[PDB]
Every structure is written in structure tokens, then in C-alpha cells.
Design a protein around this ligand. Structure first.
Ligand SMILES: COc1cc2c(Cl)nccc2cc1C(=O)N[C@@H](c1ccc(C#N)c(Cl)c1)[C@H]1C[C@H](O)CN1
Length: 336
């Protein structure tokens, strides 16, 4: 099998070492509508004037990026996204920059974020949750083979595409790492114990986070929650879970082995690696190759009423895209 994961790595390393740069420019796109906003930027649905194709364009303001010390994160996201290639990872088509802003143009993923679907319809059934988890399992297998740690899994970062499959976005926090690392990033509810305990950690944190995600999909809320963020940390390093009574025996077994506080016993981090997860009884009815090739009917297909449609995202006040007459922060974004 692993003649796959070897060429995938050669390809990754070639792109990683010499990143694509300046592959389009602003006036090649018509701006239609705001899909999202953030502390340093917004995301807009745009149309390519020539091909008529729809895309999602992330527009980051260089000054705000510097203000909030996000230089390294921003650079890192673009570098990773232009280097990876996998069915469940969003596709970066173009990137470029101007006097004012950085630009990332990604294939438009129209079904919106898993977070809003989960909150719209309440907990998913086990089969529905399992379909999603399987995709994350394969995605982590891939990222891990490249020594990338994702460390940002949460419902809000999974978009649903037209066929009901997952596309992962957000790679700002992802780090290439063989060995340990220390930065404390990620939503509090998803953090593994070893991150909090500050003695270093590795890719095993992704498998913990997968456990949180499966719990949230199946239950409707995360296993470890509280008003005070200090109080969340204690719940995590303790690791006591209350499983709802509707959870099947297989699911509880899998989660006891993913929400394992000791990384050295956690599933996905042992001698058999990811296979301990794939061969778990909860995944017995899953056909791993069929999921990979997208030849499994999705349990849910988003309302998809025509190509430029944005009704799966929220509505935002539109503001102007201003380009200064003068270059800002050229030195810091030269590698972008
Ligand atoms: C609405 O947000 C998106 C929509 C996309 C569509 Cl429709 N298709 C393809 C790629 C897309 C990427 C994003 C995105 O990168 N969003 C990220 C993002 C990151 C930073 C900023 C800033 N500043 C913004 Cl506006 C969005 C955040 C937003 C959520 O927390 C989850 N990830």
C-alpha cells in the first residue's frame, strides 16, 4: 500500500521547499458577497471573470496581521495549503498580495460549516457521526505521514461540500514536527492533557481531539465544558467522562481509548498506529477505501439551489476593499 504514502511525501516536500507565489491578481475576480469575518480579515465569494468559476477568497489586512503577532501563522497557513493534496483538505487555487492585503483563493465549499449543521439539527446519529469521523481518521493519517500536527480540530473548521463530504480548512496552527513541541494553541475544549501540563507533546494530540469531536457529534455537546477556562483544564487533565446512556457499547469503548489521558496508551499512538482505530468494532461497517474514493452515499446533502448561492453561510455587513497607495509590511510578507 505504502508506495502511495511515499510519493505523497516526495510531492509534499517538493512543494514545501519551493512554494508557488503570485499566481493571480485581484482584478481577475469579481467580488460577490461576504462569507465570513475575523480579527484581521474577511472571506468573500468571488467569480473568476474569465472562467466564470466560483471561489472563496480570504482577504487578510497586513497591518492587523502584524498588530496581532500572526505573521508566522499566516505565512505557515499559505505554505502548508499550497503543499498538501488530499480529498478531504480544501484546495488552494491561487495566492497573491498587494500594498494592503494578502489573498488566498480556495475552491468554494458551499454547504457551510459542520458547526452550524450540528447546532441546526442537534446531535448526529452514530452512523452519521461515523461517516464524518472516518474522513478525519484518513485525513490525520495523511497529515501525520508528513509529520504535520493539525492541532485545530473543531466542528467550525469542517466545511461540507456538495456531495456531503468534509473539507478541512484552517492550517494556521499546523506545525511540521518530528519530536515534541510546546505552543498552547487551539480552542480550550479540544486540548489534550499533555498540552496543558506543559512538558511537551506530539501528534498524539490529534487523536485525543478526534475523540472530543466524535463525542460532540454524537452527544450534541463536548465532553469537557465549563464557564471558567481554568475549570476546563482541570476537567481535561482529570479525564473523567460521563457518556450519555444512548451511546452504544462500541462507541464508549472507542472513546475510552481515544480520550486516554496518557498519550502512551492512546489509540493511534501505539505500535499498530492508525490501524488500532480503523479496526475498532465501532468502525466495523466502514469501508475505508470506499470513503477515500467518495463512493459512499453521504447521510446528509446540503440544500444547494444553484452555483453562486450562499444561503448555508450567514449574512454580514459588506465593507469596501481598500488598497493603499503605499506598500505596508513588505519585509514581513516577502516569503508569502
Ligand atoms: C467562512 O470561512 C471560510 C469559507 C470557505 C469556503 Cl466557503 N470555501 C473554502 C474555504 C473557506 C475557508 C474559510 C476560512 O478560511 N475560514 C477561516 C477564517 C480564518 C481567519 C479569518 C480571519 N480574519 C476568517 Cl474571516 C476566516 C475560519 C472561520 C471559522 O472559524 C472556521 N475557519
Amino acid at each position: 500500500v505504502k508506495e502511495f504514502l511515499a510519493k505523497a511525501k516526495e510531492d509534499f516536500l517538493k512543494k514545501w521547499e519551493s512554494p508557488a507565489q503570485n499566481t493571480a491578481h485581484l482584478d481577475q475576480f469579481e467580488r460577490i458577497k461576504t462569507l465570513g469575518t475575523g480579527s484581521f480579515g474577511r472571506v468573500m465569494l468571488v467569480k473568476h471573470k474569465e472562467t466564470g468559476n466560483h471561489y472563496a477568497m480570504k482577504i487578510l489586512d497586513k497591518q492587523k496581521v502584524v498588530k496581532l503577532k500572526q505573521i508566522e501563522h499566516t505565512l505557515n497557513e499559505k505554505r502548508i495549503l499550497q503543499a498538501v493534496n488530499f480529498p478531504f483538505l480544501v484546495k488552494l487555487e491561487f495566492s497573491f498580495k498587494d500594498n494592503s492585503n494578502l489573498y488566498m483563493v480556495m475552491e468554494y465549499v458551499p454547504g457551510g460549516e459542520m458547526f452550524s449543521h450540528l447546532r441546526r439539527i442537534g446531535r448526529f446519529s452514530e452512523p452519521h457521526a461515523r461517516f464524518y469521523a472516518a474522513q478525519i481518521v484518513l485525513t490525520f493519517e495523511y497529515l501525520h505521514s508528513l509529520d504535520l500536527i493539525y492541532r485545530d480540530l473543531k466542528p467550525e473548521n469542517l466545511l461540507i461540500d456538495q456531495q456531503g463530504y468534509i473539507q478541512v480548512t484552517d492550517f494556521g496552527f499546523a506545525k511540521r514536527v518530528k519530536g515534541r513541541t510546546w505552543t498552547l494553541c487551539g480552542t480550550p475544549e479540544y486540548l489534550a492533557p499533555e498540552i496543558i501540563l506543559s512538558k511537551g507533546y506530539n501528534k498524539a494530540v490529534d487523536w485525543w481531539a478526534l475523540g472530543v469531536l466524535i463525542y460532540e457529534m454524537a452527544a450534541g455537546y463536548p465532553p469537557f465544558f465549563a464557564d471558567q477556562p481554568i475549570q476546563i483544564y482541570e476537567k481535561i487533565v482529570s479525564g473523567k467522562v460521563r457518556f450519555p446512556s444512548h451511546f452504544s457499547s462500541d462507541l464508549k469503548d472507542l472513546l475510552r481509548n481515544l480520550l486516554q489521558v496518557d498519550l502512551t496508551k492512546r489509540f493511534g499512538n501505539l505500535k499498530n498506529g492508525v490501524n488500532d482505530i480503523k479496526n475498532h468494532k465501532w468502525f466495523a461497517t466502514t469501508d475505508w477505501i470506499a470513503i477515500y474514493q467518495r463512493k459512499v452515499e453521504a447521510p446528509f446533502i446540503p440544500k444547494f439551489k444553484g452555483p453562486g448561492d450562499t444561503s448555508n453561510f450567514d449574512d454580514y455587513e459588506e465593507e469596501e476593499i481598500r488598497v493603499s497607495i503605499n506598500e505596508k509590511c513588505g519585509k514581513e510578507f516577502s516569503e508569502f
